[PDB]
Write an enzyme that holds these catalytic residues in place. Structure first.
Site, PDB file in Angstrom:
ATOM      1  N   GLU A   1      15.427   7.836  24.050  1.00  0.00           N
ATOM      2  CA  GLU A   1      16.191   8.862  24.769  1.00  0.00           C
ATOM      3  C   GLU A   1      15.374   9.317  25.969  1.00  0.00           C
ATOM      4  O   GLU A   1      14.151   9.495  25.866  1.00  0.00           O
ATOM      5  CB  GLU A   1      16.531  10.087  23.898  1.00  0.00           C
ATOM      6  CG  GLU A   1      17.630  10.991  24.514  1.00  0.00           C
ATOM      7  CD  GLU A   1      18.331  11.907  23.505  1.00  0.00           C
ATOM      8  OE1 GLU A   1      17.665  12.308  22.529  1.00  0.00           O
ATOM      9  OE2 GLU A   1      19.545  12.228  23.683  1.00  0.00           O
TER      10      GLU A   1
ATOM     11  N   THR B   1      16.082  11.379  30.204  1.00  0.00           N
ATOM     12  CA  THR B   1      16.969  12.195  31.028  1.00  0.00           C
ATOM     13  C   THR B   1      18.205  11.413  31.448  1.00  0.00           C
ATOM     14  O   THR B   1      19.207  12.010  31.784  1.00  0.00           O
ATOM     15  CB  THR B   1      16.255  12.786  32.266  1.00  0.00           C
ATOM     16  OG1 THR B   1      16.026  11.758  33.239  1.00  0.00           O
ATOM     17  CG2 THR B   1      14.939  13.412  31.851  1.00  0.00           C
ATOM     18  N   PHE B   2      18.145  10.083  31.401  1.00  0.00           N
ATOM     19  CA  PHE B   2      19.306   9.235  31.723  1.00  0.00           C
ATOM     20  C   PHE B   2      20.386   9.162  30.651  1.00  0.00           C
ATOM     21  O   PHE B   2      21.533   8.861  30.961  1.00  0.00           O
ATOM     22  CB  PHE B   2      18.866   7.798  32.034  1.00  0.00           C
ATOM     23  CG  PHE B   2      18.206   7.102  30.858  1.00  0.00           C
ATOM     24  CD1 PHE B   2      18.968   6.455  29.885  1.00  0.00           C
ATOM     25  CD2 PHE B   2      16.817   7.188  30.689  1.00  0.00           C
ATOM     26  CE1 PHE B   2      18.357   5.884  28.764  1.00  0.00           C
ATOM     27  CE2 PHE B   2      16.220   6.597  29.584  1.00  0.00           C
ATOM     28  CZ  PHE B   2      16.988   5.944  28.633  1.00  0.00           C
TER      29      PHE B   2
ATOM     30  N   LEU C   1      16.600   3.834  19.401  1.00  0.00           N
ATOM     31  CA  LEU C   1      15.412   3.239  20.024  1.00  0.00           C
ATOM     32  C   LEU C   1      14.744   4.247  20.930  1.00  0.00           C
ATOM     33  O   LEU C   1      13.502   4.386  20.938  1.00  0.00           O
ATOM     34  CB  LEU C   1      15.798   1.956  20.809  1.00  0.00           C
ATOM     35  CG  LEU C   1      16.402   0.830  19.941  1.00  0.00           C
ATOM     36  CD1 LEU C   1      17.055  -0.284  20.774  1.00  0.00           C
ATOM     37  CD2 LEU C   1      15.338   0.303  18.988  1.00  0.00           C
TER      38      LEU C   1
ATOM     39  N   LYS D   1      21.959   0.735  26.431  1.00  0.00           N
ATOM     40  CA  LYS D   1      21.532   1.851  27.195  1.00  0.00           C
ATOM     41  C   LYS D   1      22.832   2.546  27.456  1.00  0.00           C
ATOM     42  O   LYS D   1      23.694   1.991  28.099  1.00  0.00           O
ATOM     43  CB  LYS D   1      20.907   1.404  28.524  1.00  0.00           C
ATOM     44  CG  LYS D   1      20.375   2.569  29.352  1.00  0.00           C
ATOM     45  CD  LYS D   1      19.796   2.154  30.691  1.00  0.00           C
ATOM     46  CE  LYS D   1      18.979   3.271  31.353  1.00  0.00           C
ATOM     47  NZ  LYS D   1      18.569   2.910  32.769  1.00  0.00           N
TER      48      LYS D   1
ATOM     49  N   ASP E   1       9.673   1.234  41.299  1.00  0.00           N
ATOM     50  CA  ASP E   1       9.368   2.169  40.221  1.00  0.00           C
ATOM     51  C   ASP E   1       8.677   1.601  39.014  1.00  0.00           C
ATOM     52  O   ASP E   1       9.013   1.925  37.885  1.00  0.00           O
ATOM     53  CB  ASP E   1      10.625   2.885  39.818  1.00  0.00           C
ATOM     54  CG  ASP E   1      10.332   4.147  38.977  1.00  0.00           C
ATOM     55  OD1 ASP E   1       9.246   4.740  39.058  1.00  0.00           O
ATOM     56  OD2 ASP E   1      11.223   4.513  38.229  1.00  0.00           O
TER      57      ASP E   1
HETATM   58  C1  LIG Z   1      17.047   0.179  27.943  1.00  0.00           C
HETATM   59  N1  LIG Z   1      15.612   0.094  28.234  1.00  0.00           N
HETATM   60  C2  LIG Z   1      15.240   0.821  29.457  1.00  0.00           C
HETATM   61  C3  LIG Z   1      15.499   2.301  29.352  1.00  0.00           C
HETATM   62  C4  LIG Z   1      14.771   3.140  30.374  1.00  0.00           C
HETATM   63  N2  LIG Z   1      13.345   3.182  30.079  1.00  0.00           N
HETATM   64  C5  LIG Z   1      12.486   2.373  30.932  1.00  0.00           C
HETATM   65  C6  LIG Z   1      12.909   3.945  29.056  1.00  0.00           C
HETATM   66  O1  LIG Z   1      13.664   4.674  28.426  1.00  0.00           O
HETATM   67  C7  LIG Z   1      11.443   3.841  28.687  1.00  0.00           C
HETATM   68  O2  LIG Z   1      11.271   4.267  27.359  1.00  0.00           O
HETATM   69  C8  LIG Z   1      11.921   3.567  26.373  1.00  0.00           C
HETATM   70  C9  LIG Z   1      12.697   2.428  26.572  1.00  0.00           C
HETATM   71  C10 LIG Z   1      13.292   1.797  25.486  1.00  0.00           C
HETATM   72  C11 LIG Z   1      13.191   2.354  24.215  1.00  0.00           C
HETATM   73  C12 LIG Z   1      12.415   3.481  24.008  1.00  0.00           C
HETATM   74  C13 LIG Z   1      11.770   4.090  25.081  1.00  0.00           C
HETATM   75  O3  LIG Z   1      11.012   5.228  25.027  1.00  0.00           O
HETATM   76  C14 LIG Z   1      10.709   5.788  23.759  1.00  0.00           C
HETATM   77  C15 LIG Z   1      11.652   6.916  23.427  1.00  0.00           C
HETATM   78  O4  LIG Z   1      12.512   7.261  24.244  1.00  0.00           O
HETATM   79  N3  LIG Z   1      11.486   7.493  22.227  1.00  0.00           N
HETATM   80  C16 LIG Z   1      12.458   8.414  21.635  1.00  0.00           C
HETATM   81  C17 LIG Z   1      11.823   9.711  21.157  1.00  0.00           C
HETATM   82  C18 LIG Z   1      12.798  10.238  20.154  1.00  0.00           C
HETATM   83  C19 LIG Z   1      13.187   9.021  19.368  1.00  0.00           C
HETATM   84  C20 LIG Z   1      13.109   7.847  20.342  1.00  0.00           C
HETATM   85  N4  LIG Z   1      13.952   0.597  25.751  1.00  0.00           N
HETATM   86  C21 LIG Z   1      14.147  -0.551  25.019  1.00  0.00           C
HETATM   87  N5  LIG Z   1      13.763  -0.577  23.723  1.00  0.00           N
HETATM   88  C22 LIG Z   1      14.099  -1.692  23.062  1.00  0.00           C
HETATM   89  N6  LIG Z   1      14.758  -2.767  23.512  1.00  0.00           N
HETATM   90  C23 LIG Z   1      15.110  -2.695  24.803  1.00  0.00           C
HETATM   91  N7  LIG Z   1      15.706  -3.665  25.549  1.00  0.00           N
HETATM   92  C24 LIG Z   1      15.835  -3.229  26.834  1.00  0.00           C
HETATM   93  C25 LIG Z   1      15.303  -1.982  26.964  1.00  0.00           C
HETATM   94  C26 LIG Z   1      14.842  -1.614  25.666  1.00  0.00           C
HETATM   95  C27 LIG Z   1      15.166  -1.290  28.270  1.00  0.00           C
END
Ligand SMILES: CN1CCCN(C)C(=O)COc2cc(ccc2OCC(=O)NC2CCCC2)Nc2ncnc3[nH]cc(c23)C1
Length: 351
Positions: A31, A33-34, A29, A53, A150
């Site tokens: 990635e 820095t966390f 889904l 996560k 935030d």
């Molecule tokens: C854990 N989640 C908060 C995490 C922390 N946070 C706010 C983020 O990271 C924001 O950005 C994304 C969050 C999710 C997925 C992709 C994100 O970005 C795109 C990316 O990374 N592309 C990547 C580029 C390379 C391939 C994928 N999160 C979610 N997606 C789907 N269902 C979910 N349920 C709860 C969450 C969540 C909350």
């Protein structure tokens, strides 16, 4: 199967792998820095869909995710029926040093959606609905002595980001329009209760309010400023304060919003920003010329003259009040005439 981490401490994750004898990985889904966000099926709960996560195996990230879990627990105690639009956890565990937090599976975050729409903005009705939901979610946390600290587009996610592709009426291009504008607020790791330690600086810079810049202390109104910023971004498709530095940011605030109140200038210990009671800055520098060329009064950014646009801008300006004590609260924002435009389904949360 050894557990493997890469050079930055991220878990090496493979489709088919199980964690806790329970979560089977089925997709990627995200990635950051966390760590990573992976899609799983939860075999202990009828193969329910999960976003897991998975935090880097690095002490400081593990300490932060622990803080996040403890916040999420408190939040769940106060909203046991999960009515206030927050992304709460279903489970958490330490997988060989990697903290993992299981959440409901959601769609794209609101930044990613805008980006995959080539930064074409959301239409006003979507903006309005999204505003209403955000005011609702955060009003609830504010009344339970919590500040998020935030808020930003990427921490706000659609429940389902499926979209219709339409031909833009007035431009020579396609547009992606989300079919359902229900959203959820995520990422509570920096969320702070009234009685807990307040660090000097909070927020991601673009969403950071002047009281924090000026080190005057902060509370719930911090989130309101961030919301005002986010709404601008949804409506125009570009950031309100495209800034990298404090002095520049304050200058932008002045150009877009008007003078910084002198009582705030008099109280700040950040006097290096001021000279003779006004902001001091180099008009001929790169940042100077950038701000002078690009930052205009807020009202100039209105796309149409009609009542709903005027009302949106009245509300954003009140969210962007310099004085945190005078800034609109979210309880008050929810009484704003801007929200008279919502359908009954939107207003009663039946979306
Ligand atoms: C854990 N989640 C908060 C995490 C922390 N946070 C706010 C983020 O990271 C924001 O950005 C994304 C969050 C999710 C997925 C992709 C994100 O970005 C795109 C990316 O990374 N592309 C990547 C580029 C390379 C391939 C994928 N999160 C979610 N997606 C789907 N269902 C979910 N349920 C709860 C969450 C969540 C909350």
């Amino acid at each position: 199967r050894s557990v493997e981490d890469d050079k930055e401490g991220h878990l090496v994750c493979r489709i088919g792998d199980w964690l806790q004898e329970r979560y089977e990985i089925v997709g990627n889904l995200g990635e950051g820095t966390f760590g990573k966000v992976v899609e799983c099926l939860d075999h202990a709960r009828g193969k329910s869909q999960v976003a897991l996560k998975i935090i880097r195996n690095v002490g400081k990230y593990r300490e932060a995710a622990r803080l996040e879990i403890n916040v999420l627990k408190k939040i769940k105690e106060k909203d046991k029926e999960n009515k206030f639009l927050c992304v709460l956890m279903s489970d958490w565990f330490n997988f060989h040093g990697h903290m993992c937090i299981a959440f409901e599976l959601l769609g794209k975050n609101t930044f990613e959606f805008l980006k995959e729409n080539n930064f074409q903005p959301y239409p006003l009705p979507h903006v309005r609905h999204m505003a209403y939901q955000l005011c609702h979610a955060l009003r609830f946390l504010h009344e339970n002595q919590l500040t998020h600290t935030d808020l930003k587009p990427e921490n706000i996610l659609f429940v389902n980001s499926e979209f219709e592709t339409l031909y833009n009426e007035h431009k020579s291009c396609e547009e992606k329009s989300v079919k359902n504008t229900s959203i959820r607020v995520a990422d509570f790791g920096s969320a702070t209760f009234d009685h807990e330690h307040h660090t000097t600086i909070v927020a991601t810079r673009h969403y950071r309010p002047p009281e924090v810049i000026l080190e005057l202390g902060w509370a719930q109104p911090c989130d309101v400023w961030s919301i005002g910023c986010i709404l601008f971004e949804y409506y125009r498709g570009f950031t309100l304060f495209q800034t990298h530095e404090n002095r520049e940011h304050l200058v932008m605030m002045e150009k877009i919003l008007g003078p910084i109140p002198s009582h705030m200038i008099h109280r700040t210990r950040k006097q290096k920003y001021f000279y003779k009671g006004g902001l001091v800055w180099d008009e001929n520098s790169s940042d100077g010329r950038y701000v002078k060329e690009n930052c205009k009064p807020l009202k100039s950014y209105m796309l149409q003259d009609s009542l709903e646009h005027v009302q949106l801008f009245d509300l954003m300006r009140r969210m962007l009040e310099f004085d945190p004590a005078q800034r609109i609260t979210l309880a008050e924002a929810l009484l704003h005439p801007f929200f008279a435009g919502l359908t009954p389904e939107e207003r009663s949360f039946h979306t």
